[PDB]
Structure 1
Amino acid sequence: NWSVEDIVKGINSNNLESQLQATQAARKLLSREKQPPIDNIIRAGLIPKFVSFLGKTDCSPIQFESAWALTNIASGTSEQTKAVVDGGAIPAFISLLASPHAHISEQAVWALGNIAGDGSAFRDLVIKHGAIDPLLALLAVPDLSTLACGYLRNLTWTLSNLCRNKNPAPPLDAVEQILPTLVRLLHHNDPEVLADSCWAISYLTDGPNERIEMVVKKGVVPQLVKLLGATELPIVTPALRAIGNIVTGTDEQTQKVIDAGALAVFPSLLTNPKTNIQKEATWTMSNITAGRQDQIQQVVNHGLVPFLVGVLSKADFKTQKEAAWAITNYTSGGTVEQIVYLVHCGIIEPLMNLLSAKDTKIIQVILDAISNIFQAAEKLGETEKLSIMIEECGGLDKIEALQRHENESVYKASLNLIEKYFS
């Protein structure tokens, strides 16, 4: 347990072995204390010395200890990560990727992951210094299973951070260069590699349709759907986010998710005990029911309309809001027969019950859906029978309440629904 002052004295000794012992002491402070004194180490001026130790090819022990110390400094706040970058650490760590010692190479991988993890600017700076080619070179083996497990997890995680963040998204050419390795990782049977590989794919699909397309073109949707059914929540969470991202794209991109068999997983996703899974699954459904009528029909055929009735009836409120969107999208683009089916499944009562929500947006969304359903009933001449159903379950009074509702945008719909179907 050295003091920072003694570490400084050791590192200033210009005795390589004294410097190694002091760098190890610094590593132990940074790795073993519960509040490690990162700012004290930075204020002491040690980062430039640590960075210069990364180049001591003749003393691989001090390369490792300084790489570890700098890794942990870079794991902190953006200002602490910036201190590491400002000391010249990026090119030094990239050079260390070529070390013949796997534990040192791996430590450089980890440190670069922390730097890129800070945000898009340091991510793009790591890329501009040329990290991608040597990172990918470490994974250029015929079978990933011959690599050490911890080593492969660290590389996967660092590559996922190079895929991470928007404003801006990563450079298109970097994504194109990383994707084949990422795809291979996505097929590797280590649950931690799979989780982080899924996380990377979820970042790359979180963008415009052109970004979605370069992922979908690599043929990963069947594997994402397989991972969608995993037992490990750390895998299902990013797989579902990536699937949800993809169906925000074109109808054709959405069709590849359906073709791959994703909808057969949604009975369990839409009833999942983890609130966030249910919410994301219902969000995903809302962007599928915003699709074509044949895509709505596959939602019907897989039996998912009763599950949407269920989440609308009872779920966390944010999940109920996504379900209200799913219904408004369904009623907006569905056929009359599909909308009739929705009503037969019991959508009206849970829809009316949510008109008591304090949230203004969900009220708007629901009234829109009710408008769409009446439009279907107009083409069948059944507008009265529906207004009976709505009054029968107490929905008519909530319509009455809402044309005294403060917000600008509930009146015109309450108003009009009454003028047309209730007076």
Structure 2
Amino acid sequence: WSVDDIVKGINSSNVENQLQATQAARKLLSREKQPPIDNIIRAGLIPKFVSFLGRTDCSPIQFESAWALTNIASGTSEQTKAVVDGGAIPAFISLLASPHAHISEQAVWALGNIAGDGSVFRDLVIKYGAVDPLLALLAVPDMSSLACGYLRNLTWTLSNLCRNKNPAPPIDAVEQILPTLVRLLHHDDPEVLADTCWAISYLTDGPNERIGMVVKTGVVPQLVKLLGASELPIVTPALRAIGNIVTGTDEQTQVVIDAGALAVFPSLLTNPKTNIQKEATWTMSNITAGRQDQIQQVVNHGLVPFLVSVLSKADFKTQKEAVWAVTNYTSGGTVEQIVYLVHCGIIEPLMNLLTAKDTKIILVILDAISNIFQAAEKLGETEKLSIMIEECGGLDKIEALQNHENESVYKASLSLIEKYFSEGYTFQ
């Protein structure tokens, strides 16, 4: 059909001619590679589709128009906005109660698209009262009463209500949605678990208050389990959620450790996927940023050698994260812990990254070495450590930095040269 033929049909007072045109429009919007969304908007059809959502009598045209509008709302912000301006949100929310499951579904989907656009339309969908009727659909006794296609859409739309910052989702909305997300995180469908993990990913990406909310529900254990799933779509978000939680307080970080996250991290730190390695090493760095007893659990779960090898073998983005992990460790750790780091052969692969062209990272490594030297001083083993650094070719790279553009680099490298180059309570 032409867009003209669709308009002529929709404008007909004949209810069957309207359905036929809306079918034709649903096809243009779904089957086409380059859909004529802008043509349909300009033809002034959005308001008519939106009122077809209200046609209880003819549930076919409720469904067909819900599809059409889904796909229009799936475009650019201009196109989504066009649908919202056409009054679509409260009409979709009304359809959530539809006794026809597949129409409810399409409304769940449509609302998901709108909420996905950003913080504005997210907050708006909530304002129109989308939460109560959405959670009500997952309020059944047994989750497996719902078809898996219908359930994935609900979980996805729910994740979009948890998404974005500036501002974050309203607290009242998060408090209400979380109990359902806990229940969803124990479902055995991979796609649902990925969607749920994404939701919790977004909720933990904020200040400690928001993290506290997630932690109190008791989901950290179950996330740690999902950390070691086969399905990479589950691991990626689950790891990001865990990473976000350890950005919080020492007590919040401990929940993660207490939940046995450190057992799974060897496979994360050596994952086939670059992205998982980075994120794992980033997560590690935030734990080596913590209390000395937390550093000791990193040591106890045998992870230090894994960080040492990530620092050697990984791509640069990941190596940067290892630099941070190692330096945080040297900053917070006891002399005993630093000795152990040296024994795992940190010195060389760390100092190798001094030839990196990243002024920030260079300063972080020189700090690490400064910290290690202070541990050495307390043992009276600055000579031994000097000689180990010379043997790792690290002295050549420190005095190489005395011809660097940066002044912090120049003076930090100088102070090391001047100062130091002129049981586990020894570096042997």
Post-superposition offset of 1:387: 1.2
Post-superposition offset of 1:389: 1.4
Post-superposition offset of 1:19: 1.0
Q: Deviations over 1:184-236 (max 9, x none)?
A: 00111111110000000010000111100000000000000000010110111
Post-superposition offset of 1:170: 0.3
Q: Deviations over 1:323-347 (max 9, x none)?
A: 0000010000000000000000000
Cα distance in 2 for residues equivalent to 1:316 and 1:38: 42
Q: Deviations over 1:298-351 (max 9, x none)?
A: 000110000000000110100000000000100000000000000000000001
Post-superposition offset of 1:384: 1.3
Q: Deviations over 1:20-63 (max 9, x none)?
A: 10011000010001111111111111101111111111011100
Cα distance in 2 for residues equivalent to 1:25 and 1:413: 71
Post-superposition offset of 1:164: 0.5
Cα distance in 1 for residues equivalent to 2:82 and 2:183: 35
Cα distance in 2 for residues equivalent to 1:334 and 1:189: 41
Post-superposition offset of 1:407: 2.2
Cα distance in 2 for residues equivalent to 1:404 and 1:42: 62
Post-superposition offset of 1:264: 0.3
Cα distance in 1 for residues equivalent to 2:296 and 2:206: 27
Cα distance in 2 for residues equivalent to 1:365 and 1:35: 50
Cα distance in 2 for residues equivalent to 1:123 and 1:412: 50
3-state secondary structure, aligned to 1:410: helix
Cα distance in 2 for residues equivalent to 1:124 and 1:14: 36
Cα distance in 1 for residues equivalent to 2:253 and 2:15: 60
Cα distance in 2 for residues equivalent to 1:406 and 1:64: 65
- Number of aligned residue pairs: 422
Post-superposition offset of 1:81: 0.7
With normalisation by structure 1, the TM-score equals: 0.99
Moved more, 76-85 or 7-16: 7-16
Q: Which runs of 4+ in 1 moved over 6 A?
A: none
With normalisation by structure 2, the TM-score equals: 0.98
Moved more, 357-366 or 317-326: 357-366
Cα distance in 2 for residues equivalent to 1:409 and 1:266: 35
3-state secondary structure, aligned to 2:264: helix
Cα distance in 1 for residues equivalent to 2:289 and 2:188: 35
3-state secondary structure, aligned to 2:248: coil
3-state secondary structure, aligned to 1:130: coil
Q: Report the equivalent of 1:153.
A: 152
Q: Within 5 Å, which residues of 2 pair with 1:7-406?
A: 7-406=6-405
Moved more, 42-51 or 273-282: 42-51
Moved more, 392-401 or 62-71: 392-401
Moved more, 202-211 or 11-20: 11-20
3-state secondary structure, aligned to 1:58: coil
Cα distance in 2 for residues equivalent to 1:136 and 1:242: 22
Post-superposition offset of 1:14: 2.3
Instruction: Sort the Cα spacing of 1:5 and 1:372 in 2 relative to 1 into closer, same or farther, 3 A.
Output: same
Moved more, 281-290 or 35-44: 35-44
Cα distance in 1 for residues equivalent to 2:90 and 2:150: 21
Post-superposition offset of 1:8: 1.3
Cα distance in 2 for residues equivalent to 1:40 and 1:391: 71
Moved more, 373-382 or 394-403: 394-403
Cα distance in 2 for residues equivalent to 1:171 and 1:409: 43
Q: Deviations over 1:246-295 (max 9, x none)?
A: 00010001111001100000111100010000000000000000011110
Cα distance in 2 for residues equivalent to 1:412 and 1:105: 66
**Structure 1 unmatched runs, 5+:** none
Cα distance in 2 for residues equivalent to 1:244 and 1:362: 21
Q: Deviations over 1:330-387 (max 9, x none)?
A: 0000000000000000000001111111122211111111111111111111111111
Moved more, 20-29 or 4-13: 4-13
Cα distance in 1 for residues equivalent to 2:74 and 2:408: 47
3-state secondary structure, aligned to 2:403: coil
Post-superposition offset of 1:415: 1.4
Moved more, 395-404 or 228-237: 395-404
Post-superposition offset of 1:412: 2.2
Post-superposition offset of 1:400: 1.1
Cα distance in 1 for residues equivalent to 2:211 and 2:223: 13
Cα distance in 1 for residues equivalent to 2:416 and 2:166: 42
Cα distance in 2 for residues equivalent to 1:274 and 1:127: 36
Cα distance in 2 for residues equivalent to 1:45 and 1:264: 58
Q: Deviations over 1:149-191 (max 9, x none)?
A: 1111110000000001111110000000000011100111111
Cα distance in 2 for residues equivalent to 1:273 and 1:149: 30
Cα distance in 2 for residues equivalent to 1:295 and 1:393: 29
Cα distance in 1 for residues equivalent to 2:347 and 2:125: 54
**Structure 2 unmatched runs, 5+:** 423-428
Cα distance in 2 for residues equivalent to 1:19 and 1:146: 34
Post-superposition offset of 1:408: 3.4
Cα distance in 1 for residues equivalent to 2:275 and 2:251: 27
3-state secondary structure, aligned to 2:196: helix
3-state secondary structure, aligned to 1:92: helix
Moved more, 35-44 or 184-193: 35-44
